[PDB]
Amino acid sequence: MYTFVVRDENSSVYAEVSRLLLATGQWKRLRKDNPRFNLMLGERNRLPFGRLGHEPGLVQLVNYYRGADKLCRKASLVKLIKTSPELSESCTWFPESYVIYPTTDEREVFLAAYNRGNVWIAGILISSEASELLDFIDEQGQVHVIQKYLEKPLLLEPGHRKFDIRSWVLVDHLYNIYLYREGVLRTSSEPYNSANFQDKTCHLTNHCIQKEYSRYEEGNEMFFEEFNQYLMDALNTTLENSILLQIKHIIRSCLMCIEPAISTKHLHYQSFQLFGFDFMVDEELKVWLIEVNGAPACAQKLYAELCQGIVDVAISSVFPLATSIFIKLHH
Amino acid sequence: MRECISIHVGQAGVQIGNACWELYCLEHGIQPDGQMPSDKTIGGGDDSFNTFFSETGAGKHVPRAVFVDLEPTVIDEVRTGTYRQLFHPEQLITGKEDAANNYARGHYTIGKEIIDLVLDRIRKLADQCTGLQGFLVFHSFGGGTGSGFTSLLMERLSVDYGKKSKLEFSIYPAPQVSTAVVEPYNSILTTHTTLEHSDCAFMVDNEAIYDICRRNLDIERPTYTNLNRLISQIVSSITASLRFDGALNVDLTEFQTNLVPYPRIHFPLATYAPVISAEKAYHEQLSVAEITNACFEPANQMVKCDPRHGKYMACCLLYRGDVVPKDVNAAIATIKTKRSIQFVDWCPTGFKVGINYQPPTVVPGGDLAKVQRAVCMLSNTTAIAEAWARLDHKFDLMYAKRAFVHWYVGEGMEEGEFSEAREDMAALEKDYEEVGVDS
Amino acid sequence: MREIVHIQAGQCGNQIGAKFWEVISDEHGIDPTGSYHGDSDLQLERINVYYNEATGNKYVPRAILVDLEPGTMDSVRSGPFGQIFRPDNFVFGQSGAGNNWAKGHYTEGAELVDSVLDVVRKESESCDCLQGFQLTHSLGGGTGSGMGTLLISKIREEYPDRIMNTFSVMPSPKVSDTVVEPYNATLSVHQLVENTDETYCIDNEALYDICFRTLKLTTPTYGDLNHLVSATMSGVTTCLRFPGQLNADLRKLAVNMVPFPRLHFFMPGFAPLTSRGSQQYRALTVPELTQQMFDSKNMMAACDPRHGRYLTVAAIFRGRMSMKEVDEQMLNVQNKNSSYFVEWIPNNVKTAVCDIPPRGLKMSATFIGNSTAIQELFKRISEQFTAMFRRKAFLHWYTGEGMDEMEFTEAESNMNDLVSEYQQYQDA
Amino acid sequence: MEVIELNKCTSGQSFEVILKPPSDPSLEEIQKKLEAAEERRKYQEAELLKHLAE
Ligand SMILES: CC[C@]1(O)C[C@@H]2CN(CCc3c([nH]c4ccccc34)[C@@](C(=O)OC)(c3cc4c(cc3OC)N(C)[C@H]3[C@@](O)(C(=O)OC)[C@H](OC(C)=O)[C@]5(CC)C=CCN6CC[C@]43[C@@H]65)C2)C1
Ligand SMILES: Nc1nc2c(ncn2[C@@H]2O[C@H](COP(=O)(O)OP(=O)(O)OP(=O)(O)O)[C@@H](O)[C@H]2O)c(=O)[nH]1
Ligand SMILES: Nc1nc2c(ncn2[C@@H]2O[C@H](COP(=O)(O)OP(=O)(O)O)[C@@H](O)[C@H]2O)c(=O)[nH]1
Ligand SMILES: [Ca+2]
Ligand SMILES: [Mg+2]
Ligand SMILES: [Mg+2]
């Protein structure tokens, strides 16, 4: 009988995972601050990693990687890509980006490469005239970052509409990197306007902001079945060749970059984590990394399969019980 | 030449002290009866080793040490041990009943009946010094005497020796070998009260030593004897520069200079390598690069924590045996690329290094294999704060229900010293946090 | 030497007292005449905790024998180890206490108490470093109960800074049929709550169940019951009598076991359970020991541990066995049933091992639990008490000795306070 | 990268290797605390002996 605790009640993914564990009959849930647990499904912020792995007779595992925040904050990711030689300023697949504080950063060198196609992004806002946006941040109290907005996105037909791709990746205690074979396109429901940019409607792809200010596919979510079919019929390529290889590459690069810093290989507790990578595909079927989310939600149709895969690969490999849905990315 | 006096307090301090003093003797060629044939100046000296041993006209080299425990059992062993002739009766002090794992009893009640005696014995050794540099103090966090008496002593020592350095060797409590549920209480009380009086304290988590013993020595259920022989190796590595010819860490003050920029943050992490089983039918001997790299493995730390997620303020490498600077410098640049080693901005990313050619001395019949080369790293990293977080959370769990508090109050302590002590530790956790937050 | 002074009072007190001294005399290699005949020097190392040493190199139990009638005193004298006790330490009367707490505590008892205290004082002024006292007595009768608790109050008055420890036998209508026992018990529990540091609750209800249901003794005797009491008393004092790191003196035990002054009533447990003469064939495994010692059926108090939570536990393993496996099996119990140990007292389970096994056994384990489930014991007594007291039934036996009923109202109140206080911490 | 302050002897050597540059109470007051705690300890016993007297 394995034991676990729940310290993030807000998570929908690990809601399902705890459901799946209790239903096995070889797990039992404890009170939140009962220390004698095998598994911790931890809080999103200020997780006490310092207190893990000091329980004699307990092998302990936690669903987060300490230090992975450096990949899952925008400021931190820019910083990590610009100063990490594994990724380099020679990084073909991340949009030009600068970190800026509201009046150790680079507010200066932002305008320097400016006055040399000038359209950028910054509760958001887009523009081509820098001077104004730099006040948008000034007003606000958080460190905002700015990057070149992608002028020419790949636009779906029928509709002339832009999208982003979300892929789900699982990294286990051995630092095997597993890509869920199912990803999702979060689509814009209304057409794409190249003219005046400052309208948060057909440029922002995120889900909730389209259940509001906005048919073709259900819930503006198109799955790999569909999108692969489209690519074959309109562009005569496959999802795999024109896109996934680039996505598999970027994922490999990012997570191998930080492995030395967060690996729990020789540590007294073990970590695994679920990431949500978000990408953009442009006109030339070139793929771009937008953000890495450390506490991702899952698409509704898929919860059952993904959460099942989490128990199989991340949890039960450490805690055995009584084809695969992932693509192992080798290294 | 300038002397140091060692003070061993409570059971942990005393048994560790016997391990260290036994190990010192084997390193300097001092026999159990106190005779040191190698020593050609009889009845006196200003050699480096004289910092730890005084001499008699009869050729006796006797430790500059005092042992103090509120109960006689443990020190009685010393009084009858194989090194009984080493010490003279005046430096072995005992009481009748102990502090019963109660800090208040060690500090206030039973402490007051013995503090002036201890200080008088300490005065006697001090007067025999031509240039006393200060004190090394050995004790547990968890015992009544180790926690309560020690903090009493430490305060009095600042009064009677306002200008001397005080170093600590502190045993931090682990359930696997601990003996009171109340040890987190005692740990936070003594840390609070001793903090302003200690220049530099080396913390040893029994948990860390227990597991190094299990894993690297093949000891299924480590005893204190096992733990203590390993601890004396680390202690010896740390004090070697005081007892031998050299130019690094040659006086007590230099420990603080090299390791402690911030007074309150005076808890260096020690990491030791290599630890190899003597029952092992020969181990492929490790290189400079290999034992140096091992210094950045949590599993070889005196405290389990993760220095990756903190910053360094200072780092010293102490080698014993077959080591020359070139192989060291070449071990470092390799590591500096393989590992994430982040010093604070207001700090040079760098290592002070010390090599002593005498390889580690091991106790005959002990568990440790002899090796041609070893290293002890002392790194002041913010990561050690993890052990304060652990300790403080256990304190909070019990204190919220006032569990066991009546035992302290019954000894004359006020509830207020609990909260005050915890608040001080809350401030100490925040100081570490400030110092280590690029991320 | 950190001496303990042992006092035994009344019939039950002296019978379990005598068997305790007989059992540990054997373990320490002492014989009926007070001569050592043991192998290990391990037996003689802390021998002075319980025994005084004279010239003739004899060992005399630091034990005082108290009763208001001569009966059981003569019984002890002719008993197997009758001759080891200091003759001047037999202190007895002629009246008896008639199963009446008031007589033990206020009238007959008061007449005898001072001569008892003289012998205590003699034994105490002799000690290098006196730990404190232990008393055996029942709570259902008159002498152990009433006079027993009087002695505790007077001893505490002369030695307020010493530990007071008792082995207290609780009455059960499964074993006896004297109708006032719940009166005597409640009056005594009130005393014990205020005046002892540690009390082992030895429940004749649980002793009966073990003997009759588990050991299949269809005509159980006090001899059978006491076989279990003596095994448990040897077990819980092991860490006092042999070299060891944990709970090695009465105060350190109290500091580890007592988070709140009033909540100092322990549930003892023992494994394996055996009858006298029931020869042991297969020694238990370490696993078996551990499961059993925590099993409700092995508790010497008739309380279901699953109905409460442990504040603190001491576990003592005896015999040659793997210290590694003991550690592993003890962690397993806590890791597997962790909801039954309160979360706000970290690492509240402590484990000791002693290589010397007890007579007849290769492997034994003794459990000492501070469980909130002990409230069931006090609730049981309390209902019995109130069923009579609300009609003032049999009270004249007490008022005739000078007591008021207000003193009954208070004991009842205090014991119900104690129960609810356990209930506070059970939830928390 | 850069080696500094190399000290040698027959016992061994010391040096510093740099990889990068940057970017109390009196004896009197103690008595006062001890005596006070002992005062409470004495007051506590007094109360107790007193209760035992009733
Ligand atoms: C361990 C001490 C002990 O020997 C334990 C029991 C009682 N006594 C004295 C000896 C004794 C026992 N029975 C006796 C009958 C006549 C004379 C003497 C006895 C004793 C026994 O060995 O039985 C075979 C015994 C007694 C009892 C006994 C069990 C028992 O031994 C098995 N009881 C459980 C009670 C008793 O009240 C009961 O069964 O509770 C419902 C039980 O009632 C019935 C219906 O049998 C009974 C029987 C005499 C009746 C009235 C009150 N007392 C209180 C205790 C109880 C008893 C055993 C002391
Ligand atoms: N490493 C090591 N730890 C020890 C040793 N002795 C005790 N400890 C640890 O120290 C703590 C117990 O405190 P002790 O030093 O034994 O107690 P004390 O200082 O004598 O104080 P009192 O006995 O209460 O008067 C526990 O955490 C023990 O595990 C030892 O010899 N070596
Ligand atoms: N376990 C046990 N209980 C006993 C023994 N003798 C009496 N009792 C119990 O103690 C209570 C009777 O008190 P008793 O000691 O005889 O009265 P006292 O002499 O006035 O102290 C009842 O609960 C009896 O069942 C005994 O030898 N062993
Ligand atoms: Ca000399
Ligand atoms: Mg001791
Ligand atoms: Mg009777």
mmCIF file of C-alpha atoms in Angstrom, chain A residues 73-288:
data_model
loop_
_atom_site.group_PDB
_atom_site.id
_atom_site.type_symbol
_atom_site.label_atom_id
_atom_site.label_comp_id
_atom_site.label_asym_id
_atom_site.label_seq_id
_atom_site.Cartn_x
_atom_site.Cartn_y
_atom_site.Cartn_z
ATOM 1 C CA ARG A 73 8.743 32.004 -16.618
ATOM 2 C CA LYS A 74 9.001 34.267 -19.663
ATOM 3 C CA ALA A 75 11.785 36.427 -18.208
ATOM 4 C CA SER A 76 13.676 33.280 -17.138
ATOM 5 C CA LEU A 77 13.328 31.556 -20.529
ATOM 6 C CA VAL A 78 14.706 34.553 -22.479
ATOM 7 C CA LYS A 79 17.555 34.782 -19.954
ATOM 8 C CA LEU A 80 18.136 30.996 -20.194
ATOM 9 C CA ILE A 81 18.202 31.007 -24.007
ATOM 10 C CA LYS A 82 20.452 34.061 -24.335
ATOM 11 C CA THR A 83 23.043 33.022 -21.731
ATOM 12 C CA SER A 84 23.040 29.238 -22.196
ATOM 13 C CA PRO A 85 25.639 28.075 -24.750
ATOM 14 C CA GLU A 86 23.755 24.815 -25.431
ATOM 15 C CA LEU A 87 20.981 26.982 -26.889
ATOM 16 C CA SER A 88 22.999 30.080 -27.788
ATOM 17 C CA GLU A 89 22.122 33.425 -29.348
ATOM 18 C CA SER A 90 22.459 31.131 -32.345
ATOM 19 C CA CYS A 91 19.008 29.724 -31.621
ATOM 20 C CA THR A 92 17.041 29.514 -34.847
ATOM 21 C CA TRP A 93 13.715 28.607 -33.245
ATOM 22 C CA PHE A 94 12.961 31.234 -30.601
ATOM 23 C CA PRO A 95 11.695 34.704 -31.485
ATOM 24 C CA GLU A 96 13.955 37.691 -30.775
ATOM 25 C CA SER A 97 13.187 38.749 -27.191
ATOM 26 C CA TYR A 98 14.183 41.309 -24.548
ATOM 27 C CA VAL A 99 13.460 41.555 -20.816
ATOM 28 C CA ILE A 100 12.341 44.967 -19.534
ATOM 29 C CA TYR A 101 11.722 46.346 -16.030
ATOM 30 C CA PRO A 102 9.068 49.006 -15.236
ATOM 31 C CA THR A 103 10.984 52.140 -14.207
ATOM 32 C CA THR A 104 20.353 43.973 -14.475
ATOM 33 C CA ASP A 105 18.247 43.948 -17.666
ATOM 34 C CA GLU A 106 18.329 45.214 -21.252
ATOM 35 C CA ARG A 107 15.631 47.849 -21.858
ATOM 36 C CA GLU A 108 18.320 49.625 -23.890
ATOM 37 C CA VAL A 109 19.452 47.013 -26.433
ATOM 38 C CA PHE A 110 15.790 46.449 -27.302
ATOM 39 C CA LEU A 111 15.484 49.756 -29.180
ATOM 40 C CA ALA A 112 18.979 49.266 -30.607
ATOM 41 C CA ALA A 113 18.002 46.376 -32.921
ATOM 42 C CA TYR A 114 14.658 48.122 -33.455
ATOM 43 C CA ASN A 115 15.712 51.046 -35.675
ATOM 44 C CA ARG A 116 17.328 48.598 -38.085
ATOM 45 C CA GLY A 117 9.274 44.563 -40.483
ATOM 46 C CA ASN A 118 9.221 46.102 -36.979
ATOM 47 C CA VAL A 119 6.239 44.539 -35.148
ATOM 48 C CA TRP A 120 6.448 43.237 -31.567
ATOM 49 C CA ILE A 121 4.348 41.836 -28.707
ATOM 50 C CA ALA A 122 4.453 42.619 -24.974
ATOM 51 C CA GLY A 123 -3.188 41.304 -20.096
ATOM 52 C CA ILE A 124 -1.154 41.957 -23.252
ATOM 53 C CA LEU A 125 -0.743 44.336 -26.212
ATOM 54 C CA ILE A 126 0.894 44.487 -29.671
ATOM 55 C CA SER A 127 2.415 47.365 -31.662
ATOM 56 C CA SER A 128 5.040 48.609 -34.119
ATOM 57 C CA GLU A 129 5.764 51.914 -32.412
ATOM 58 C CA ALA A 130 7.917 50.984 -29.413
ATOM 59 C CA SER A 131 7.597 54.221 -27.400
ATOM 60 C CA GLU A 132 3.992 53.534 -26.392
ATOM 61 C CA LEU A 133 4.228 49.927 -25.197
ATOM 62 C CA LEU A 134 7.218 50.805 -22.996
ATOM 63 C CA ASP A 135 4.667 52.850 -21.049
ATOM 64 C CA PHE A 136 2.192 49.977 -20.897
ATOM 65 C CA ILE A 137 4.762 48.045 -18.874
ATOM 66 C CA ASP A 138 5.811 51.150 -16.921
ATOM 67 C CA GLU A 139 2.245 51.420 -15.646
ATOM 68 C CA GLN A 140 2.117 47.763 -14.616
ATOM 69 C CA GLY A 141 4.087 46.368 -11.697
ATOM 70 C CA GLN A 142 5.425 43.130 -13.158
ATOM 71 C CA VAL A 143 8.581 42.489 -15.176
ATOM 72 C CA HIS A 144 7.306 42.250 -18.743
ATOM 73 C CA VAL A 145 9.171 40.827 -21.730
ATOM 74 C CA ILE A 146 8.858 41.744 -25.423
ATOM 75 C CA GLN A 147 9.570 39.724 -28.587
ATOM 76 C CA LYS A 148 8.980 40.075 -32.325
ATOM 77 C CA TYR A 149 5.354 39.246 -33.014
ATOM 78 C CA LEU A 150 5.178 36.683 -35.813
ATOM 79 C CA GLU A 151 4.167 38.700 -38.895
ATOM 80 C CA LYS A 152 3.249 35.782 -41.174
ATOM 81 C CA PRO A 153 1.667 32.836 -39.304
ATOM 82 C CA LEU A 154 0.498 29.643 -41.018
ATOM 83 C CA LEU A 155 -3.203 30.234 -41.605
ATOM 84 C CA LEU A 156 -5.760 27.422 -41.680
ATOM 85 C CA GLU A 157 -8.394 27.149 -44.405
ATOM 86 C CA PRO A 158 -11.251 27.465 -44.703
ATOM 87 C CA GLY A 159 -11.186 30.622 -42.576
ATOM 88 C CA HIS A 160 -7.789 32.275 -42.968
ATOM 89 C CA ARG A 161 -7.241 31.690 -39.252
ATOM 90 C CA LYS A 162 -4.192 31.413 -36.993
ATOM 91 C CA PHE A 163 -3.498 28.936 -34.165
ATOM 92 C CA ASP A 164 -0.921 27.649 -31.699
ATOM 93 C CA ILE A 165 0.190 24.086 -30.982
ATOM 94 C CA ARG A 166 0.288 22.741 -27.445
ATOM 95 C CA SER A 167 2.313 19.580 -26.804
ATOM 96 C CA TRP A 168 2.347 17.684 -23.503
ATOM 97 C CA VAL A 169 5.689 16.334 -22.297
ATOM 98 C CA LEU A 170 6.412 14.106 -19.305
ATOM 99 C CA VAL A 171 9.863 13.928 -17.736
ATOM 100 C CA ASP A 172 10.297 11.073 -15.284
ATOM 101 C CA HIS A 173 12.694 10.423 -12.369
ATOM 102 C CA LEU A 174 15.285 8.928 -14.758
ATOM 103 C CA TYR A 175 15.014 12.078 -16.929
ATOM 104 C CA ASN A 176 13.532 10.158 -19.804
ATOM 105 C CA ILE A 177 11.648 12.701 -21.920
ATOM 106 C CA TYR A 178 8.218 11.556 -23.092
ATOM 107 C CA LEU A 179 6.118 13.355 -25.700
ATOM 108 C CA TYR A 180 2.374 12.579 -25.594
ATOM 109 C CA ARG A 181 1.472 11.409 -29.124
ATOM 110 C CA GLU A 182 -1.622 13.653 -28.939
ATOM 111 C CA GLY A 183 -1.191 17.440 -29.023
ATOM 112 C CA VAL A 184 -3.775 20.143 -29.773
ATOM 113 C CA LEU A 185 -4.203 23.186 -31.997
ATOM 114 C CA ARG A 186 -5.858 26.053 -30.149
ATOM 115 C CA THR A 187 -7.423 27.873 -33.090
ATOM 116 C CA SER A 188 -8.686 31.375 -33.739
ATOM 117 C CA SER A 189 -12.354 31.189 -34.724
ATOM 118 C CA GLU A 190 -12.351 34.521 -36.567
ATOM 119 C CA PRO A 191 -10.095 35.558 -39.541
ATOM 120 C CA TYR A 192 -6.614 37.115 -39.326
ATOM 121 C CA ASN A 193 -6.155 40.892 -39.702
ATOM 122 C CA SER A 194 -2.682 42.078 -40.739
ATOM 123 C CA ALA A 195 -3.599 45.792 -40.481
ATOM 124 C CA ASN A 196 -4.075 47.529 -37.116
ATOM 125 C CA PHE A 197 -2.738 45.093 -34.487
ATOM 126 C CA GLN A 198 -4.006 46.414 -31.142
ATOM 127 C CA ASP A 199 -7.212 44.347 -31.216
ATOM 128 C CA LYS A 200 -6.989 41.309 -28.910
ATOM 129 C CA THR A 201 -9.299 39.116 -30.989
ATOM 130 C CA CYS A 202 -7.792 37.245 -33.940
ATOM 131 C CA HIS A 203 -4.177 37.421 -32.782
ATOM 132 C CA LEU A 204 -4.472 35.895 -29.306
ATOM 133 C CA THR A 205 -5.077 32.162 -29.559
ATOM 134 C CA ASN A 206 -5.452 31.181 -25.882
ATOM 135 C CA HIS A 207 -8.643 29.279 -25.128
ATOM 136 C CA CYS A 208 -10.612 31.320 -22.572
ATOM 137 C CA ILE A 209 -10.137 34.490 -24.621
ATOM 138 C CA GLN A 210 -12.057 32.863 -27.488
ATOM 139 C CA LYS A 211 -14.950 31.531 -25.462
ATOM 140 C CA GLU A 212 -15.459 35.272 -24.994
ATOM 141 C CA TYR A 213 -14.549 37.775 -27.729
ATOM 142 C CA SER A 214 -15.440 35.363 -30.560
ATOM 143 C CA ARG A 215 -17.742 26.976 -35.480
ATOM 144 C CA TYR A 216 -15.255 25.147 -37.750
ATOM 145 C CA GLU A 217 -13.912 22.691 -35.200
ATOM 146 C CA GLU A 218 -15.380 21.974 -31.758
ATOM 147 C CA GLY A 219 -14.196 24.307 -28.986
ATOM 148 C CA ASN A 220 -11.613 25.821 -31.349
ATOM 149 C CA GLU A 221 -9.637 22.653 -30.703
ATOM 150 C CA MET A 222 -8.297 20.655 -33.628
ATOM 151 C CA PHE A 223 -6.586 17.346 -32.946
ATOM 152 C CA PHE A 224 -3.745 15.574 -34.718
ATOM 153 C CA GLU A 225 -6.059 13.416 -36.826
ATOM 154 C CA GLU A 226 -7.681 16.500 -38.335
ATOM 155 C CA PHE A 227 -4.665 18.798 -38.667
ATOM 156 C CA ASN A 228 -2.546 16.074 -40.247
ATOM 157 C CA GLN A 229 -5.300 15.484 -42.803
ATOM 158 C CA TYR A 230 -5.367 19.208 -43.581
ATOM 159 C CA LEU A 231 -1.594 19.390 -44.073
ATOM 160 C CA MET A 232 -1.822 16.486 -46.495
ATOM 161 C CA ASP A 233 -4.634 18.018 -48.543
ATOM 162 C CA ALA A 234 -3.581 21.657 -48.737
ATOM 163 C CA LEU A 235 0.218 21.521 -48.409
ATOM 164 C CA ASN A 236 0.936 17.923 -49.455
ATOM 165 C CA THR A 237 3.003 17.193 -46.328
ATOM 166 C CA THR A 238 2.413 15.453 -42.996
ATOM 167 C CA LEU A 239 2.295 16.770 -39.446
ATOM 168 C CA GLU A 240 5.246 14.496 -38.587
ATOM 169 C CA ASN A 241 7.666 15.766 -41.284
ATOM 170 C CA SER A 242 6.868 19.470 -41.510
ATOM 171 C CA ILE A 243 6.317 20.141 -37.813
ATOM 172 C CA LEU A 244 6.683 17.375 -35.197
ATOM 173 C CA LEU A 245 10.411 16.788 -35.932
ATOM 174 C CA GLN A 246 10.995 20.495 -35.159
ATOM 175 C CA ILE A 247 8.878 20.223 -32.025
ATOM 176 C CA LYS A 248 10.644 17.045 -30.894
ATOM 177 C CA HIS A 249 13.938 18.915 -31.434
ATOM 178 C CA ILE A 250 13.062 22.014 -29.403
ATOM 179 C CA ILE A 251 11.748 19.944 -26.489
ATOM 180 C CA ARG A 252 14.952 17.890 -26.475
ATOM 181 C CA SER A 253 17.090 21.013 -26.519
ATOM 182 C CA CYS A 254 15.327 22.890 -23.728
ATOM 183 C CA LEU A 255 15.109 20.043 -21.235
ATOM 184 C CA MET A 256 18.615 18.757 -21.936
ATOM 185 C CA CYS A 257 19.845 22.287 -21.397
ATOM 186 C CA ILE A 258 18.695 22.347 -17.772
ATOM 187 C CA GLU A 259 19.178 18.642 -16.932
ATOM 188 C CA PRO A 260 22.427 19.295 -14.989
ATOM 189 C CA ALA A 261 20.616 21.884 -12.866
ATOM 190 C CA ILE A 262 17.450 19.965 -11.978
ATOM 191 C CA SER A 263 18.140 16.224 -12.420
ATOM 192 C CA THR A 264 17.237 14.237 -9.290
ATOM 193 C CA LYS A 265 19.500 11.331 -10.331
ATOM 194 C CA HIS A 266 21.746 11.337 -7.254
ATOM 195 C CA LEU A 267 19.275 13.082 -4.962
ATOM 196 C CA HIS A 268 17.541 11.879 -1.756
ATOM 197 C CA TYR A 269 14.083 12.373 -3.258
ATOM 198 C CA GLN A 270 12.949 11.982 -6.873
ATOM 199 C CA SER A 271 11.027 14.338 -9.179
ATOM 200 C CA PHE A 272 8.963 13.994 -12.308
ATOM 201 C CA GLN A 273 7.053 16.755 -14.106
ATOM 202 C CA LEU A 274 4.438 17.458 -16.763
ATOM 203 C CA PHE A 275 5.145 20.411 -19.067
ATOM 204 C CA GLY A 276 3.007 22.112 -21.652
ATOM 205 C CA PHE A 277 5.105 23.459 -24.531
ATOM 206 C CA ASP A 278 3.385 25.970 -26.840
ATOM 207 C CA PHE A 279 4.534 26.516 -30.447
ATOM 208 C CA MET A 280 3.774 28.602 -33.540
ATOM 209 C CA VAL A 281 3.951 27.450 -37.168
ATOM 210 C CA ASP A 282 4.656 30.120 -39.775
ATOM 211 C CA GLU A 283 4.146 30.419 -43.557
ATOM 212 C CA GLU A 284 7.265 28.419 -44.417
ATOM 213 C CA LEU A 285 6.204 25.531 -42.156
ATOM 214 C CA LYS A 286 8.828 26.642 -39.670
ATOM 215 C CA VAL A 287 8.115 25.992 -35.980
ATOM 216 C CA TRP A 288 8.628 28.481 -33.137
#
